Design a protein around this ligand. Structure first.
Ligand SMILES: [Mg+2]
Ligand SMILES: [Mg+2]
Ligand SMILES: [Mg+2]
Ligand SMILES: [Mg+2]
Ligand SMILES: [Mg+2]
Ligand SMILES: [Mg+2]
Ligand SMILES: [Mg+2]
Ligand SMILES: [Mg+2]
Ligand SMILES: [Mg+2]
Ligand SMILES: [Mg+2]
Lengths: 127, 95, 53, 287, 55
RNA sequence: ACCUCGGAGCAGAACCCAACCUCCGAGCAGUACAUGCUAAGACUUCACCAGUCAAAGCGAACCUCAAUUGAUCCA
RNA sequence: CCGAGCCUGGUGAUAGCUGGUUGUCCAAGAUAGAAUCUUAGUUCAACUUUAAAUUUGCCCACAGAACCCUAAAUCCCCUU
């Protein structure tokens, strides 16, 4: 109907079809997600670790031993985030933390090791 | 202060307070503390940081300049790349 | 005219500077200082005078 | 009602039976008598009653408060600073539920301001309207919203439901006609062609992440994929629905309306639309 | 103002809900506004009068 | 003769208190160069201008004296 | 009626200074000080007034508030 000299077809002739503008890991259907509020909306993600086939074997148990705190009794890893009021942004940094966890898996503590050394030098005892 | 002009008969704002102060829509006014660009060598670190920090204004001197300014400067302005957007509104204010 | 105020400049070319007092008779001084940009103690040399005190 | 059955029995209303609401018009109090007349509320003796008081903000020779404070770059170039009015997708969901703006057609600033969604004051230097992340929940618009500025969450929420977002810059006199074209149609001149963005906002309107109308269409699938990868939501390919053509309806630069174009003069009384049909005039309006 | 569409699902998003029809027989009734909203409003006065009104 | 600032008595005991009332002083000096950045909470020379104290955190090591001085524009 | 004439006009010049400011009736109500080419004035403070939001306000009981160099008191303070 009307095409200017700065039109899309004139600026970039590589793309002509309007359908080209709308062409096409972490399976959401496998994951379990819930939401609540406490004034910020919290997003709680849960999923079974050992059942995730999209994660490889060495990465899976690595997350298990390094993040022993968050695993549930039933075997599901639980994760929460309530920084923002937007559940989408809550779901955003949730999977970002999961992405940061698998990447590093594929790759006061000063006081703690002191007492462990104190405990080790205390137990010189034979049967 | 110049209540009615001669060419249109309207209030006239002096550009002094424009350069010195800034408005938040709640009715608050801030300012840079004076003496922050003179004789910094003799001042202790606690003093110069107190001068660098902004400071609000009393209700009286705020009301005084509010009488001076006109309604154009009191409107709501939605600036971009403006850190004062969080502060134009007020939250959790009782009495 | 006992003391003199002098500025010093970062030798790394960052442009960080400050001032301190100095005696009119004492020779040039070179001292360390914590540059906020380089973020560690680094030597500054003072160049000229600003005012007497 | 209990109000009207009193008036039929009560007498007829006239100027003599007329009276305002008590408490509205308080009586004027003039300085004549014993109470006010003596001094009329001006003080005993001094500039207060003599009328030679100093100006406002004078400290009797002492430096006023407004000069002792130093100058700082608070509001410099405020008549050229970047301004845009907010718009929340909560309101967009609200307005479509009211039915003033139809989601069946492409939404636009014209359809918006014709709906009185938000006022706009182009002579107060606001070059459009921005989307606001407040309202991410309860949003099923599916509209092809036209906007100037856009947030990341707003684009993700709109694209998740199948809508379309796109930025389109307008000049000052190109925008006031956009938000209100009919008075220019009472003038009869040809509608003016749009311009490119200014010498600083071009990186914004050329980027693909913010849906720039100068950006390529080939890069929008990539930006859509990253947002779906970012905020964890399925990416509905909108090519399937029957109204996919409607969703992709967009205006090229130097054109205001999808139908009209620069140079096209429009008339309402004895409705007619006219062209120049001159080579020199036509080839410039395209430019 | 156009009469809004008859949504198949209620309550409509954005907390909107049109009035029930027929109305309830009562000694009174509260009508909606031009935008078919509830005529309940807020107001501040004297800096401290923190009230709400119905019209 | 004085015009600013600090200390003592008048003002004995939370605070403040003047007199062309009685005394002693100041307009510096010395040592570091983290005399770096930020931050809770409070006082305040009876207003304001100013002047003050500072937890904690980042980053590091392992200030004394009492006044000891000066706003805005402008350069 | 010349330390510089008289007339008009600018001019209703300006004057922190004096002079005076019109009907009736009622309530509340004199209040530390700082700065100023400032002390015959003005801005702020404090006091006073109006219309309101909220809850503590006042009197205050044991305890508590310096060595230096023996006063009437004072500050704070739950109860009442
Ligand atoms: Mg007087
Ligand atoms: Mg008189
Ligand atoms: Mg005068
Ligand atoms: Mg109102
Ligand atoms: Mg005080
Ligand atoms: Mg600390
Ligand atoms: Mg004569
Ligand atoms: Mg006069
Ligand atoms: Mg009385
Ligand atoms: Mg009590």
């Amino acid at each position: 109907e009307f095409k200017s000299i700065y039109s899309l077809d004139k600026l970039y002739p590589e793309s002509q079809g309007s359908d080209t503008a709308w062409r096409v890991d972490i399976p959401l259907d496998r994951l379990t997600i819930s939401y609540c509020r406490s004034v910020n909306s919290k997003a709680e993600v849960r999923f079974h670790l050992a059942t995730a086939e999209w994660i490889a074997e060495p990465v899976r148990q690595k997350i298990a031993i390094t993040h022993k705190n968050k695993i549930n009794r039933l075997g599901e890893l639980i994760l929460t985030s309530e920084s923002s009021r937007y559940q989408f942004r809550n779901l955003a940094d949730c999977l970002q933390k999961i992405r940061d966890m698998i990447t590093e898996a594929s790759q006061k503590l000063h006081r703690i090791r002191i007492e462990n050394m104190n405990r080790e030098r205390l137990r010189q005892k034979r049967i | 202060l110049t209540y009615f002009s001669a060419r249109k008969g309207k209030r006239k704002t002096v550009k002094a307070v424009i350069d010195r102060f800034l408005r938040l829509h709640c009715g608050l006014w801030v300012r840079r503390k004076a003496g922050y660009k003179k004789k910094l060598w003799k001042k202790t670190p606690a003093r110069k940081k107190r001068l660098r920090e902004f400071v609000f204004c009393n209700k009286t001197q705020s009301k005084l300049l509010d009488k001076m300014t006109t309604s154009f400067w009191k409107r709501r302005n939605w600036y971009v790349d403006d850190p004062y957007q969080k502060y134009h509104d007020r939250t959790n204010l009782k009495v | 005219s006992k003391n003199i105020l002098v500025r010093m400049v970062s030798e790394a070319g960052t442009g960080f500077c400050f001032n301190t007092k100095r005696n009119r008779l004492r020779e040039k001084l070179t001292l360390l200082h914590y540059d906020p940009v380089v973020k560690q103690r680094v030597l500054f040399v003072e160049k000229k005078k600003i005012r007497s005190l | 009602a209990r109000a009207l059955d009193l008036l039929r029995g009560l007498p007829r209303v006239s100027l003599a039976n007329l009276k305002p609401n008590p408490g509205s018009k308080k009586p004027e109090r003039r300085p004549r008598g014993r109470r006010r007349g003596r001094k009329c509320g001006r003080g005993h003796k001094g500039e207060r009653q003599r009328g030679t008081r100093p100006r406002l903000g004078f400290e009797g020779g002492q430096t006023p408060f407004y000069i002792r404070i130093p100058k700082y770059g608070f509001n410099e170039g405020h008549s050229f600073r970047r301004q845009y009015k907010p718009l929340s997708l909560n309101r967009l969901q609200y307005l479509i539920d009211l039915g003033r703006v139809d989601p069946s057609q492409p939404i636009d600033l014209t359809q918006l301001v014709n709906g009185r969604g938000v006022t706009i004051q182009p002579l107060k230097r606001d070059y459009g309207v921005q989307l606001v992340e407040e309202g991410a929940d309860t949003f099923t618009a599916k509209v092809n919203i036209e906007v100037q500025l856009a947030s990341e969450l707003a684009i993700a929420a709109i694209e998740k439901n199948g809508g379309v977002v796109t930025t389109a810059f307008y000049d000052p006199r190109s925008l006031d006609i956009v938000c209100k074209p009919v008075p220019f149609f009472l003038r009869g001149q040809p509608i003016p062609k749009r311009m490119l963005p200014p010498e600083e906002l071009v990186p914004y309107y050329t980027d693909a992440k913010n849906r720039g109308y100068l950006a390529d269409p080939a890069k929008f699938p990539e930006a859509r994929l990253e947002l779906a990868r970012k905020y964890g939501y399925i990416l509905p390919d909108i090519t399937k629905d029957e109204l996919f053509k409607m969703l992709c309806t967009r205006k090229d630069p130097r054109q205001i309306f999808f139908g009209l174009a620069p140079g096209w003069v429009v008339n309402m009384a004895d409705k007619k639309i006219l062209k120049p049909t001159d080579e020199n005039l036509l080839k410039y309006y395209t430019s | 103002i156009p009469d809004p569409p008859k949504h198949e699902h209620y309550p409509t998003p954005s907390g909107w809900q049109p009035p029930r029809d027929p109305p309830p027989n009562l000694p009174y009734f509260v009508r909606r506004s031009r935008m078919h909203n509830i005529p309940v409003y807020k107001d501040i006065t004297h800096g401290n009068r923190q009230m709400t009104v119905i019209r």
